[PDB]
Amino acid sequence: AELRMEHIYKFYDQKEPAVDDFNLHIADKEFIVFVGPSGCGASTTLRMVAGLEEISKGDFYIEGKRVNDVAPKDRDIAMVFQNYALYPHMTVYDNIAFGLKLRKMPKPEIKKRVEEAAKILGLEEYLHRKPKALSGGQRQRVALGRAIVRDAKVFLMDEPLSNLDAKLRVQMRAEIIKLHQRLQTTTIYVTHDQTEALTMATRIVVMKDGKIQQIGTPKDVYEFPENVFVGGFIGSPAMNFFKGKLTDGLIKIGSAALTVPEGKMKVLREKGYIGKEVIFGIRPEDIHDELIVVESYKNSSIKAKINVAELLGSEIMIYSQIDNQDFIARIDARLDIQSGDELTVAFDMNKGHFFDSETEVRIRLE
């Protein structure tokens, strides 16, 4: 289904809204992740969508029908993780069928939908077992079949991995991804975990304090963050940020001076940033081990002291600074590199971003 949120607001007791002008158009088959820190308003928004909470202002549409006034049960939404407990004395089959039985659906049609769900969950050999005979990993899949047999237009998932242990969490995460690949049901998934957002979504809605910060594919949000908060929240280790003073062709950070690409320089000039203090952002992977990288970087190298060098698989995380401004670089593993040495690094200024010092909003050079 297509969903439209048109200028939605939620207010409680205080006159600052908990959700502020939430505007979004979700296409069919998208897996949309709402992500942000504590109090971002994602979970409230999801419950407004479910119809557990009332919309204060604006319109919510499902397939172009305004459903603000429609009761939860009539919205054709499945709250996938609600009433999730299994009946211990019923089979897998019966735990998945239960809601259809209550609905008096004919037995054969029940059978057809149940078997189909079991195949999608990988439970076809287990249909006549009891829950106790399934492992923990298999057992947590069963109640998803209740959502699939419902034949709903949209699935809602509110932070379903948050209370699971590590081993069950990895398996649920994977199950959710598969369920989206096999059924393609339009889904809204709320989390506080930016890695889940990057790896599970078709598109992400980054939220803070009830306000949409950015909407985009995971790659778009990562590569072109709207502001400094998004740049710092998405990615781990997240973007490095520096204060410097822009001149004609150079950004001077502490006692370093990095050449700014002409293309970017032109726009910054035209927007009137020459001679002003600006925030410069650059990802760890875009700070290169200058020795090794095949590319030549034109006057954007510095000598950095290695505070710590941490091997992580085939990469090294380097913790350093430009004067008093800390940064992390993420380079390919090499052996000489040791905590305490010096290392020349080259900033890829084609991947650098500039943000306004007062607004923290990214300055569109693209």
Numbering used by the authors: 2 to 367
From the paper:
ABC exporters and importers share a core structural design composed of at least two intracellular nucleotide-binding domains (NBDs) and two transmembrane domains (TMDs) embedded in the lipid bilayer that form the translocation pore, and the same mechanism of ATP binding and catalysis to energize the movement of substrates across the membrane. Later, our laboratory and others demonstrated that Gram-positive bacteria have orphan NBDs that are able to energize multiple ABC type I sugar importers. Finally, we solve the crystal structure of the B. subtilis multitask ATPase MsmX K43A; the crystals diffracted up to 1.67 Å resolution and based on comparative analysis we hypothesize about sequence and structural features involved in the broader specificity of NBDs. MsmX K43A shares the fold of well-studied NBDs of ABC type I importers.
K43 is involved in ATP coordination and catalysis, interacting with the β- and γ-phosphate groups. Its replacement by an alanine resulted in 80% decreased ATPase activity, impairing the normal function of MsmX to energize the AraNPQ transporter in B. subtilis. The crystal structure was solved at 1.67 Å resolution and the final electron density map allowed to model a detailed refined structure, which comprises all residues of MsmX K43A, except the N-terminus methionine. Interestingly, most crystal structures of NBDs from ABC transporters show a dimer in the asymmetric unit, promoted either by the C-terminal domains or the presence of ATP (or analogs). This is not the case for B. subtilis MsmX, that crystallized as a monomer with one molecule in the asymmetric unit, and very few contacts with symmetry related molecules, as indicated by analyzing the protein interface using PISA server. MsmX N-terminal domain presents the general α/β-type ATPase domain fold, which comprises the RecA-like domain (residues 2–87 and 155–235, in blue) and the α-helical domain (residues 88–154, in yellow). The regulatory C-terminal domain (residues 236–365, in red) forms a mixed barrel with 3 α-helices and 11 β-strands. In the ligand-free MsmX K43A structure here reported, the A-loop length is similar to the one in ATP-bound MalK, already in a conformation that favours nucleotide binding. The MalK F81-Y87 region accommodates the MalF/G helix, providing an hydrophobic environment; in MsmX, the corresponding phenylalanine (F82) is flipped, causing the side chains of Q83 and N84 to point towards the complex interface, which decreases the hydrophobic character of the cleft. Furthermore, in the hydrophobic pocket involved at the interface with the MalF/G, MalK A73 is at 3 Å from the MalF helix, while in MsmX this residue is replaced by K74, which affects considerably the electrostatic potential, the volume and the hydrophobicity of the corresponding pocket.
